[PDB]
């Protein structure tokens with residue numbers, strides 16, 4: 048036995064899953080990519096409906112041009128750590144873009160969204176303090192809790208009442224961080240942030256909201272679910288990513304806290320990693336600025352989402368949400384085999400959606416998750432609906 | 446009080462440091478960048494000697510071209526998580542490049558070197574198992590220990606004897622990971638990997654070596670200190686980064702372990718973050734392939750390092766190493782003020798080096814750290830020596 052013997056179980060179960068299906072959903076490799084919404088997968092022209100490219104920014108001509116120009120002028124990489132080795136002025140500029148986008152006095156960029164959550168949670172809450180989070184929080188949030196030395200306080204999924212009860216029972220004096228997500232990504236439903244933030248404030252807790260799945264298309268300024276729900280000026284920290292709507296890699300936290308800059312001095316995942324490459328920062332900055340006024344993209348994204356949600360519901364698919372509340376539409380299937388057969392039929396027919404099954408989802412939940420793009424056309428969404436109807440009828444789902 | 450009151454001390458001490466100097470070393474911002482070795486900083490043409498661009502790959506014309514082409518063909522970003530949302534074939538290709546570079550059967554790329562260490566350490570060693578590491582290990586290694594649930598076993602810095610003693614006293618049955626760094630980056634000295642690996646094997650431990658500071662210029666194939674010391678085929682895992690020699694962002698782990706692929710199934714920092722952008726993967730792949738045969742760059746890097754080390758030693762500077770053992774040359778100063786005055790004089794005179802002082806360094810250690818580039822010319826290194834002599838004499842160091 049050695050350090051990898053602990054994975055013998057995972058190896059056996061993976062092999063079992065792969066034997067029982069055709070295409071390995073964990074090893075999808077695109078061959079050629081035309082657009083935000085079309086690629087060649089397994090030799091077939093395929094509509095992409097399983098990516099997080101919500102605002103279709105990744106082929107925006109200004110975004111691409113900024114990236115190319117940055118490569119030319121500043122090269123492929125960086126000096127090292129921003130704090131230790133210095134940085135290009137582009138990093139100051141992307142932080143300014145985030146200040147402008149969110150209307151905050153503070154913005155700190157990280158190498159990934161994962162690291163932004165890891166770093167901010169583990170740095171803000173120390174020994175004897177509390178992080179309070181939804182039981183079904185994103186892995187990066189749990190990992191931030193694990194990295195830190197605070198107490199962790201789970202509350203029942205989507206329960207304002209349980210948040211209130213659990214907070215109320217904690218010792219009064221120690222500082223507290225309530226961490227919420229605007230969009231629950233599994234089913235594409237939305238958190239009751241207005242009510243939960245009121246509860247947090249009643250108990251004197253600070254609030255961090257992850258707005259990774261809402262950027263550019265929730266709220267008057269596209270800031271997120273918190274903005275849509277009227278919470279401007281009440282959220283202590285907002286965490287996000289560049290990897291969904293913005294169209295690159297990176298993470299960030301924004302805040303109006305007057306001591307927010309001190310996070311740079313203490314945050315190990317910020318200090319001990321190289322700064323992002325010029326092309327990445329340039330694409331992010333250009334994209335973020337365009338997202339401030341991308342009303343047409345936002346319009347199409349929501350029209351497409353509502354068309355898909357309403358259309359699938361009308362066909363008799365069981366969806367994760369009664370109304371179209373985000374750009375994720377989740378189709379719920381009866382069992383493992385049905386989910387795989389449906390997913391495979393869709394793929395074979397020219398549509399790629401995300402399949403989520405246990406243990407990624409709770410036992411008994413088997414999903415096909417559709418993530419809409421601002422650059423899908425109405426015709427493409429109609430094609431998608433037809434593909435779902437055909438595959439659903441063939442497999443026996445509807 | 447709130448969650449940021451814990452930083453009041455850091456805020457006060459930072460302000461004290463800034464008041465006692467002129468330029469803030471933690472906020473160096475380059476204005477214009479010409480080459481791997483020259484930029485405009487505070488309006489002055491400045492030789493760069495504080496970056497980790499060891500092989501000067503960041504303006505390599507093939508590297509830049511690959512990045513630009515990837516932006517054009519594949520866009521600014523990715524589908525999401527490789528495992529959950531699929532990937533472009535470029536990711537398979539960079540992993541293949543790493544297999545070819547290191548001569549291994551396994552390669553896993555991560556979004557950063559920090560995350561590669563975080564992920565691999567926390568995933569390989571579980572509850573009841575042991576991670577054994579140098580007391581002065583890199584922060585990412587300690588952070589990997591913190592993220593995991595293993596026992597941690599520090600040994601006295603650079604002590605083969607203490608590694609042996611500490612390992613020998615652990616329970617025999619549980620699996621064990623010894624984590625070593627090839628180059629100690631603070632002073633630029635080298636670890637006795639040959640002797641330490643023999644000790645690890647005597648006690649049945651697996652070995653992970655971080656070769657972030659050696660890639661392309663140690664060993665017959667540029668694989669690292671372990672290769673230079675004849676340890677090919679004896680190292681279980683090698684971790685590295687794209688952010689130094691390769692010239693972008695990213696991390697990786699390579700291995701010949703037959704179950705290495707299982708790490709993807711279990712490693713949360715690999716699973717729960719977006720894949721790297723096309724431009725980044727393309728620049729990395731092109732660079733890694735060129736690094737396999739970059740003999741001229743390697744030659745210049747080492748010639749430059751030896752010229753600088755020997756030249757500073759001859760002038761009467763106290764260096765961190767008796768012989769030139771890496772591409773980091775550390776100058777040791779007597780006190781905080783002397784270090785800052787010297788660093789400032791160098792900067793004002795047109796040279797940027799890294800200043801490392803407590804608590805980044807041990808109390809009593811005050812360093813100017815020079816990191817050599819393959820693209821420095823002999824004339825530039827002579828200019829540097831003259832700048833050190835002038836500043837050293839003016840400040841009173843020599």
Ligand SMILES: *Cc1c(COP(=O)(O)O)cnc(C)c1O
Pocket residue numbers: 159160161162164185187188228232257259260288289290291296297298717718719
């Ligand atoms: C997408 C997401 C992340 C990860 O962001 P990356 O930039 O891909 O690392 C973390 N937390 C939440 C809630 C997310 O939605």
Ligand SMILES: *Cc1c(COP(=O)(O)O)cnc(C)c1O
Pocket residue numbers: 319320321557558559560562583585586626630655657658686687688689694695696
């Ligand atoms: C540079 C370095 C890292 C961090 O790599 P990034 O790619 O900058 O995150 C981690 N560990 C060691 C030993 C390093 O040298």
